[PDB]
Amino acid sequence: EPAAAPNGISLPAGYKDWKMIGVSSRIEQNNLRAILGNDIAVKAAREGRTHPWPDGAILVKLSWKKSTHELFPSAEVPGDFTQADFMVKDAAKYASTGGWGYARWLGMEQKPYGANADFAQECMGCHSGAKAADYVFTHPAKLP
Amino acid sequence: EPAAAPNGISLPAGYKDWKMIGVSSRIEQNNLRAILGNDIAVKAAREGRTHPWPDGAILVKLSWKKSTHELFPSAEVPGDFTQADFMVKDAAKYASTGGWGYARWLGMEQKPYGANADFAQECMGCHSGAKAADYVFTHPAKLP
Ligand code: HEC
Ligand code: HEC
């Protein structure tokens, strides 16, 4: 498997098979993103158990560069895979970063992100803004 | 159970638990979309067996109106759920519409779309542009 993140978090195996929580696009990143979760995170998302999210929930955000469909040029679609971002809920273990273990792996090569074991402070620079929602921006997409 | 589509196709049960094939955004629709598939479709997508897609593959496209995150205005995120669009592969049964059974259900109330049993001719009006790719536009997103 890929190397662990600098804070010791291992890449969750088989995350590409996880169920969908939502999707997004960031104007400044020129990307498309999928937000998936493990079974605990998906149950929590669906039942609104996000105040706080329960221990063991793992969220993944997958990002691709925007590209356009040759046969349909107004369709913005995934190009190159850029990264997999994770948040692992463990209120006690990760109390210093809002109860979440942050980790990122870059590209198809799955290179662990971060200069040192303190790298998650970057993530917290933005995710602190979402403190009222237990540090999670994503609102689970509505489905029947 | 939601009413069947005008061509007799029943709403696939449990589609929200299906694995991710990709995501998209249509500039003219002001939306965000997820593309999921049943496990027949997902295996085909991952192995590149999409010439043609195997019988029994079901693709679903879920659409939400774009909305912006209150805490991060440049993050385009799902608002209202607009529709679930399906293609069910059955080369023999749906030979008249490219080997796919098309069907759409609207909104959280899951109202079947289509004026009459011939509604899928609309879908074909665009999807015929993709005939050389077995009537499917989506290129499965790349993941490691
Ligand atoms: C999305 C994210 C997710 C999904 C959970 C969530 O909080 O919605 C993960 C697992 C993750 N990020 Fe964070 N991120 C930001 C925003 C606004 C969103 C929601 C909109 C969207 O889908 O794009 C996020 C913002 C930021 C940010 C501000 C510039 C930074 C610096 C980060 N994110 C950093 C990180 C991480 C540090 C390595 C990390 C593991 C993240 N994000 C995980
Ligand atoms: C996406 C779609 C999917 C996913 C499979 C695929 O072909 O990619 C389904 C199940 C579906 N649609 Fe079709 N559709 C169009 C385009 C360009 C894309 C790819 C880009 C994206 O993700 O947005 C599609 C185009 C059109 C179109 C041209 C204006 C029409 C009229 C339709 N689509 C119509 C239908 C349906 C008729 C009711 C139907 C069941 C569809 N699409 C299913």
Residue numbers in the entry:
A (entry chain A), B (entry chain B): 18 to 161
What did the article's authors report about this structure?
Cytochromes P460 oxidise hydroxylamine within the nitrogen cycle and contain as their active site an unusual catalytic c-type haem where the porphyrin is crosslinked to the protein via a lysine residue in addition to the canonical cross links from cysteine residues. Cytochromes P460 consist of a homodimer with one haem P460 per monomer. The oxidation of hydroxylamine is a key part of the process of nitrification, whereby fixed nitrogen is converted to biologically available forms such as nitrate, in a range of bacteria. Here we describe the evidence for a novel double crosslink between lysine and haem in the cytochrome P460 from Methylococcus capsulatus (Bath).
Initial attempts to reduce the protein in the crystalline state using chemical reagents or by exposure to X-rays were unsuccessful as assessed by electron density (checking for movement of the iron coordinated water molecule) and crystal spectroscopy (checking for optical spectra changes that would indicate reduction). Preparation of crystals in an anaerobic glove box followed by incubation with sodium dithionite and cryotrapping resulted in successful generation of one crystal in the ferrous form as assessed by single-crystal spectroscopy of cryo-trapped crystals after reduction, Fig. 4 and S14.† The difficulty of obtaining a stable reduced form rendered it infeasible to obtain a room temperature or SFX structure of the ferrous protein. The optical absorption spectrum revealed a large spectral shift relative to the as-isolated ferric form consistent with successful reduction. Crystallographic data were measured from this reduced crystal, yielding a structure at 1.33 Å resolution. In the crystal structure, the haem distal binding position was vacant, consistent with loss of water molecule upon reduction. This results in 5-coordination of Fe(ii), which therefore moves 0.2 Å towards the proximal side of the plane of the haem. Instead, a water is 3.1 Å from the nitrogen of either pyrrole ring A or D, with an additional water 3.1 Å from the nitrogen of pyrrole ring C. Residue Lys78 only shows the single crosslink between its sidechain nitrogen and the γ-meso carbon of the haem (CHA carbon), not the crosslink between its CD carbon and the C2A carbon of the haem. The second crosslink (Lys CD–haem C2A) is broken in the crystallographic ferrous structure, causing the terminal (CMA) carbon of pyrrole ring D to change from methylene (–CH2) to methyl (–CH3). The experimental ferrous cryo structure showed a CD Lys–C2A haem distance of ∼3.7 Å, indicative of a single crosslink structure. In the ferrous cryo structure, Asp102 is the furthest from the iron centre (average 5.9 Å), consistent with proton transfer not being needed at this stage of the catalytic cycle, because no ligand is bound to the iron. However, after collection of the X-ray diffraction data (0.20 MGy dose), the peak shifted to 451 nm.
